[PDB]
Design a protein around this nucleic acid. Structure first.
Ligand SMILES: [Mg+2]
Ligand SMILES: [Mg+2]
Ligand SMILES: [Mg+2]
Ligand SMILES: [Mg+2]
Ligand SMILES: [Mg+2]
Ligand SMILES: [Mg+2]
Ligand SMILES: [Mg+2]
Ligand SMILES: [Mg+2]
Ligand SMILES: [Mg+2]
Ligand SMILES: [Mg+2]
Ligand SMILES: [Mg+2]
Ligand SMILES: [Mg+2]
Ligand SMILES: [Mg+2]
Ligand SMILES: [Mg+2]
Ligand SMILES: [Mg+2]
Ligand SMILES: [Mg+2]
Ligand SMILES: [Mg+2]
Ligand SMILES: [Mg+2]
Ligand SMILES: [Mg+2]
Ligand SMILES: [Mg+2]
Ligand SMILES: [Mg+2]
Ligand SMILES: [Mg+2]
Ligand SMILES: [Mg+2]
Ligand SMILES: [Mg+2]
Ligand SMILES: [Mg+2]
Ligand SMILES: [Mg+2]
Ligand SMILES: [Mg+2]
Ligand SMILES: [Mg+2]
Ligand SMILES: [Mg+2]
Ligand SMILES: [Mg+2]
Ligand SMILES: [Mg+2]
Ligand SMILES: [Mg+2]
Lengths: 112, 120, 48, 43
RNA sequence: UUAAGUUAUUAAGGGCGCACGGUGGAUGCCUUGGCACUAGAAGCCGAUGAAGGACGUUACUAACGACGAUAUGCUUUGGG
RNA sequence: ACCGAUAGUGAACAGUACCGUGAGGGAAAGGUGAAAAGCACCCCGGAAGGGGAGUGAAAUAGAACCUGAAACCGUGUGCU
RNA sequence: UGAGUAGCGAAAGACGGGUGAGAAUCCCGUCCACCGAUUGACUAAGGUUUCCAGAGGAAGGCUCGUCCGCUCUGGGUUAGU
RNA sequence: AUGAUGAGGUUAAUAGGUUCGAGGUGGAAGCAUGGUGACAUGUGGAGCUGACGAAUACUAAUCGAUCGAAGACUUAAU
């Protein structure tokens, strides 16, 4: 079948998380863990914590074989932003966006 | 040679503080580019130890700091005596080398390539 | 000094076609463990 | 560079504050206008 | 086999259409609050210390209401 | 034959947050469900979040809780 | 949108050990460096709990954060001169 | 600038070190002697030396992984 796991309101901005997220889609799960431990972006241990959760759902809730699974989907949606300010010069301020993300990966065994 | 992002007087001080603690502890952990430079400094300092006369004892004291080692069995020796006492014994047959560099991954706060340099 | 027109969605997306990232080296720890980085030392989850 | 509003505790209570408003007729007018808006702090 | 000629195949990325999601809070439905008026009473208290406020009061207490060292209320007469 | 939350009182939750030395100026912010029955228990995780299970007529009704448009951000794809 | 662009607010750090899911950035130690008619020590205005202990890591901190002038709980100012 | 370019990757002199040189500086430390002493002389063209030259596997360039063709049709000579 398919299993999934999402992580909602992650403080990293969505453009920054989609870079590392493009390396792992379409690949099987053993390679995808090895990639996320060796890229030094800040997003990498957050995605890797999510992919662990989706593998554990397939073993427990659905009784799949974890040795042969592939990543079907991996994507990141926007969450709500936090609006801050920063004082610039001559009494003027500027706006700063603290972005958030919802991360979703699904995993499957390719059969019906 | 490299500049290491420091001024001329700061680079000299950082490079002989770094070479002293490699004599004390015999393997330390630092960045890649700093370990490439202390490679040649500490091996020119073992060459002074293998000669062993007074005039090179005076010349190695230009570089090392004044650090006491709490040696085992409650004895205590300086860092200069430990260079002419033990390291000069182990490398009396070898003709260079004396050090090696082993790479590791980046640190978290930077992308700085960590490196262990050891004394062989 | 300031942009005269906005940039459309296509021209923005054609610009960041090289704004990518590459896969790392990924050798193996042959003695015991998972994959390590090439020319590095398999310290954790590794024996090489 | 020195700014305006160098604060002082005696002076603020003496050009403003309750007893100074009560001592004139026009000071009593401003207490009546702030009771009519329902302003929480008077003087 | 050689010459001359014609025509294919790629999509790093982009465009159109379709499907599925997210953010965001329009629209619809609603009302706890308001606006304008009618009829009938009544219009302004105070040195016997006012209007308006400050401090406090609940077993556990931050704000609002009520109350005042008899303090999150007391007595009596009638309802229930 | 007045308004229905950008309306109608500035104010449906305030002359308060806030600004000003001061007179003074002055906001924003409504809606789970019939009933709280408001997710026992298991699994990943340091937690936050989530997948199952269960309540319920309905949980893409889970408290940032009716309906959920558009801008905008993404993932797949048929023709190019 | 500009755009992963400008900027991240004068200055010298290095190593070891520890704690922790996690450490350039927290604690301990050694060396090094800066001020020193002052980056030292007192007292006034002014501000009003920012003081101390223990616990914490959503927001704040121009990075990180196991830390904090931040959050929670509880404590603390004593005069005949 | 980055990237590209070029020299090399153990069947190896790519870099570092070690040894020997070039060139630069100009007579080390210690000891002895003379001098009241400041100092001078000898040991000794000494000692020190970044980038330059040659030799030497002492240290490190490990193990590995990825991409990459399978000669279309028509006609005329052969
Ligand atoms: Mg964060
Ligand atoms: Mg200013
Ligand atoms: Mg100087
Ligand atoms: Mg793109
Ligand atoms: Mg593509
Ligand atoms: Mg009357
Ligand atoms: Mg009764
Ligand atoms: Mg209104
Ligand atoms: Mg509405
Ligand atoms: Mg004020
Ligand atoms: Mg309003
Ligand atoms: Mg939970
Ligand atoms: Mg629905
Ligand atoms: Mg919403
Ligand atoms: Mg309804
Ligand atoms: Mg809704
Ligand atoms: Mg860039
Ligand atoms: Mg530009
Ligand atoms: Mg630029
Ligand atoms: Mg910059
Ligand atoms: Mg700074
Ligand atoms: Mg440390
Ligand atoms: Mg310290
Ligand atoms: Mg000084
Ligand atoms: Mg001070
Ligand atoms: Mg005071
Ligand atoms: Mg404190
Ligand atoms: Mg503490
Ligand atoms: Mg934090
Ligand atoms: Mg932060
Ligand atoms: Mg902890
Ligand atoms: Mg505090």
């Amino acid at each position: 079948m398919e299993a999934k796991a999402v992580a909602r309101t992650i403080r990293i901005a969505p453009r920054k998380v989609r870079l590392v997220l493009d390396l792992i889609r379409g690949k099987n799960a053993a390679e995808a863990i090895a990639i996320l431990k060796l890229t030094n972006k800040a997003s990498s241990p957050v995605i890797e914590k999510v992919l662990m959760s989706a593998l554990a759902n397939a073993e427990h809730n659905y009784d799949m074989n974890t040795d042969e699974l592939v990543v079907k989907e991996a994507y990141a949606n926007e969450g709500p932003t936090l609006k801050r300010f920063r004082p610039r010069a001559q009494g003027r301020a500027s706006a700063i966006n603290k972005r958030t993300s919802h991360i979703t990966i699904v995993v499957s065994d390719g059969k019906e | 040679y490299r500049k290491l992002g420091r001024t001329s007087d700061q680079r000299k001080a950082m490079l002989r503080d770094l070479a002293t603690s490699l004599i004390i502890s015999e393997r330390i952990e630092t960045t890649e580019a700093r370990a490439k430079e202390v490679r040649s400094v500490v091996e020119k300092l073992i060459t002074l130890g293998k000669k062993g006369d007074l005039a090179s004892r005076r010349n190695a004291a230009k570089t090392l700091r004044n650090v006491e080692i709490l040696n085992e069995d409650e004895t205590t020796q300086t860092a200069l005596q430990k260079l002419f006492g033990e390291i000069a014994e182990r490398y009396t047959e070898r003709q260079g080398g004396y050090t090696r560099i082993l790479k590791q991954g980046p640190r978290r706060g930077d992308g700085a390539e960590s490196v262990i340099i050891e004394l062989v | 000094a300031v942009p005269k027109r906005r940039t459309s969605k296509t021209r923005k997306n054609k610009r960041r076609t090289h704004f990518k990232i590459s896969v790392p080296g990924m050798t193996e720890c042959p003695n015991c463990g998972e994959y390590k980085l090439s020319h590095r030392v398999c310290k954790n989850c590794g024996s090489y | 560079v020195k700014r305006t509003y160098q604060p002082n505790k005696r002076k603020h209570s003496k050009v403003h504050g309750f007893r100074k408003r009560m001592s004139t007729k026009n000071g009593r007018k401003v207490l009546a206008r702030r009771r009519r808006k329902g302003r929480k702090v008077l003087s």
